[PDB]
């Protein structure tokens, strides 16, 4: 009987060796997370299909993001096996309305304050 | 097994007396007995004569053991009641209850219409009050209308042939009988048609259901061989006579040739019985039109298996637990497939062990029953 099946809480239990292996720290978590699809909407639970629909993941291999709330955490972990998340960082400040236009996303995590036209 | 039910020493000794026919409880009996001993109001559909009456009675005996004798004061009604649709079924139930209550303290009584009401309403029958009483609905309704019995004193009710008790002739008298509503209600049957079960829902509150065997149309017993009559009705009785000639072989070997014939109409049963008695067959006929004393004598003879050929009307299709039932002929195929299956389960009522022969005649109205035969 295939179902939305139970998985342990240890799947979301990190390790200090893991936090070193990953780029994460136990303190000061991420403010917003990003997500993407790299697996088929086909051949999973239809419940999970509408879950990915709820995720705004009707595109695929395209970026999207949300606020990584615990409810959002559970929603993502429901469809985690098909999806990927990213620590959608922003080393600079958040985009002010004065700087409303010049923003972008560099895949390592950067949100651009001003993506100008000349190099460094 | 039976010891899992915590039977009393009288109950354990009676169960040991039921050996080798009872060495352990049946699986349906295992499912039924302690849940009833849990006091839950429920209905159980299972094999006829599968010890289901004993499974209901053992938990009833345990519940009556927890009941005080002070409710057994004079003039009141019983606390343990059972219902049967036929006087013969009620008499058989009362006879079975009197064996178990010989080593117990429960008083067992029977009530049915067409019998002596002086003995029914006797001072040691109605007024002294009993623990176990199996009663027909008509006699009980007459007693309640005449204040010869009560309904506030009941504590454990059993509905045998509850589907037959759910008959349109039988539902109104049962509802009139329906009375303390907190009593523990248990119903027993062979199968539950849906249109009657919701009728139970008219007087139900979170009950339980215990079903046995296949959940589909459990038409064919694995221990019963069945045949289809590929011939017209005109010589079919003659073919039945030929089957009687075949039953002549069954009369030859001593392997018991107790034959039960299904007849739809009492007058048709009388005509067929006059033909068979004319045909030098040792046949006895029981019907709803038979005299009550004559029916009682015929039922006692069939209990003794005195008449190897016995015809039965619509009054005697289901519920039968007859020893040595080896020959069953639906001389008239039953108008209900449930009725045909119930007549089939009436024979070989010792369980999955005692074998028997089944032959059913086929008529034109039963042509649509051929699809039911599929």
């Amino acid at each position: 009987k295939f179902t939305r099946s139970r998985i342990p809480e240890k799947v979301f239990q990190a390790s200090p060796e893991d936090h070193e292996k990953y780029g994460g720290d136990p303190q000061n978590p991420h403010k917003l997370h990003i997500v993407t699809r790299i697996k088929s909407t086909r051949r999973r639970p239809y419940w999970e299909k509408d879950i990915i629909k709820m995720l705004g993941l009707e595109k695929a291999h395209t970026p999207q993001v949300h606020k990584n709330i615990p409810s959002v955490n559970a929603k993502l972990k429901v469809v985690k096996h098909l999806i990927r998340i990213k620590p959608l960082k922003l080393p600079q400040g958040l985009p002010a309305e004065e700087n409303m236009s010049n923003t972008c996303l560099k895949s390592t995590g950067e949100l651009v304050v001003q993506w100008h036209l000349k190099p460094v | 097994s039976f010891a899992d039910l915590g039977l009393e020493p009288r109950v354990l000794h009676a169960l040991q007396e039921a050996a080798p026919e009872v060495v352990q409880p049946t699986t349906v009996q295992s499912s039924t007995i302690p849940s009833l001993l849990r006091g839950r109001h429920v209905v159980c559909a299972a094999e006829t004569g599968s010890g289901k009456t004993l499974s209901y009675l053992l938990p009833l005996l345990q519940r009556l053991l927890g009941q005080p004798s002070l409710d057994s004061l004079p003039i009141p009604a019983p606390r343990g009641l059972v219902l049967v649709p036929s006087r013969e079924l009620a008499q058989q139930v009362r006879a079975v209850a009197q064996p178990l209550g010989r080593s117990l303290g429960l008083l067992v009584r029977d009530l049915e219409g067409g019998h002596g009401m002086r003995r029914i309403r006797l001072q040691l029958s109605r007024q002294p009050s009993a623990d176990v009483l199996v009663a027909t609905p008509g006699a009980l309704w007459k007693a309640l209308k005449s204040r010869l019995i009560s309904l506030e004193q009941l504590s454990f009710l059993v509905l045998d042939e509850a589907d037959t008790l759910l008959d349109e002739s039988f539902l109104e008298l049962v509802d009139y009988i329906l009375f303390n509503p907190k009593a523990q209600l248990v119903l027993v049957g062979a199968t539950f048609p849906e249109g009657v079960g919701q009728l139970l829902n008219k007087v139900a509150s979170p009950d339980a259901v215990t079903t046995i065997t296949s959940s589909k149309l459990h038409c064919i017993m694995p221990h019963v061989k069945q045949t289809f009559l590929r011939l017209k009705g005109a010589d079919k009785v003659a073919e039945l006579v030929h089957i009687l000639k075949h039953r002549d072989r069954a009369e030859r070997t001593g392997p018991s040739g107790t034959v039960l014939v299904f007849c739809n109409s009492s007058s048709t049963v009388n005509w067929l019985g006059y033909i068979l008695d004319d045909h030098k067959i040792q046949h006895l006929r029981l019907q709803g039109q038979m005299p009550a004393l004559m029916r009682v004598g015929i039922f006692q003879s069939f209990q003794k298996s005195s008449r190897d050929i016995l015809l039965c009307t619509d009054i005697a299709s289901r519920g039968l637990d007859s020893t040595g039932v080896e020959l069953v002929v639906n001389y008239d195929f039953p108008p209900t497939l449930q009725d045909y299956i119930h007549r089939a389960g009436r024979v070989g009522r010792v369980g999955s062990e005692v074998p028997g022969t089944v032959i059913s005649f086929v008529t034109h109205p039963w042509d649509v029953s051929l699809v039911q035969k599929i």
Partner: protein, 46 residues
């Protein structure tokens, strides 16, 4: 190019709104905790 600009403005507006939501949620959680502590302190009098 205008399409990419609009999509960028969309992602920026979403991130900003989520940031404001998270900040207000933390502030509300702290305010609720402070109110609960004040009520617990004021429920031990008279």
């Amino acid at each position: 190019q205008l399409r990419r600009k609009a999509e960028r403005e969309t992602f920026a507006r979403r991130v900003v709104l989520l940031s404001q939501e998270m900040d207000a949620g933390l502030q509300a959680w702290q305010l609720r905790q402070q109110k609960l502590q004040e009520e617990q302190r004021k429920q031990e009098n008279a």
